[PDB]
Design a protein around this nucleic acid. Sequence first.
RNA 1: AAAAAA
Lengths: 167, 161
Amino acid sequence: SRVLLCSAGHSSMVVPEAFHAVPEGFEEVHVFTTDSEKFNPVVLNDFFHSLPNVRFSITKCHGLADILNERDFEFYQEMLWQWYLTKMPDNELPYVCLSGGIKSMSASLQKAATLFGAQSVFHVLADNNPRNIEEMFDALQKGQIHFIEMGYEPGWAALRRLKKILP
Amino acid sequence: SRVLLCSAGHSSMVVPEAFHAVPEGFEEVHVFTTDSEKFNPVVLNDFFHSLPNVRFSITKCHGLADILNEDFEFYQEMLWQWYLTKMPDNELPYVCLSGGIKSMSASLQKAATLFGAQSVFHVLADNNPRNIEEMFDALQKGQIHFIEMGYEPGWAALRRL
RNA sequence: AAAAAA
């Protein structure tokens, strides 16, 4: 049950790229983002509508478009970690791409991966930042997408068990 | 004691904004960044020359400029080495993870989580000051936003020499 | 490579 969890910001192209971090692909892809109006799923909709065997979901941190202070962040992080526990599969650690968002978003998903576990945590760098699916496919033919593996995390079984408190 | 650990990328000005996360500032400032040319230490050197009783240092990941591979077989180990030697020995440091590519911010978060931090935080600036008086203008007009992301107790990894 | 993948 290959599950990719992705943070997104205002560059939705990190998620189709993340999907190609492994040649097999992913059975599930779940994205967490702010609900800023700058967030755009159009490229995400068309891409995954073209992969009908992929369970795809967008989850927003309701009401928070920009993290600017402590309260914002603790709300973001609470809703993120609930999302992580909910979407991570039961008999297998998830794959997590922390590329999208402001730095606090990437760091909070890194910390969640360290707590609950992840088969791999990675980041994607693109020579020319593909703006579209077709330029992404161009870029990975030329080898201009670079996947940075930053480590397996076992997590803690007692922290995964927090999934029991959730609906 | 009262030690700020800061990751830097190609925007050195996150560091003096970080210094102003508290009115008292910090008694030491320690920066870690890659070895690329687009890192400019000059605004940092000029700033901290004006604060002589702050101990300031810059440490680069010698040999590594960009990180493109598995955290390029190198960044994380130097970062964690640097954190332990720079951190206070009987108190936890303050940590600003603002600068760098996402992987270097994420790696400092992880170091904070393992070794402990009094505070982990991030800094947003409306207009991205490029120099000190732009930052002091932004500070005056509420244009710099400090995001406190949380205390980290860390482990007994601190005990490492 | 701080308000959002190098």
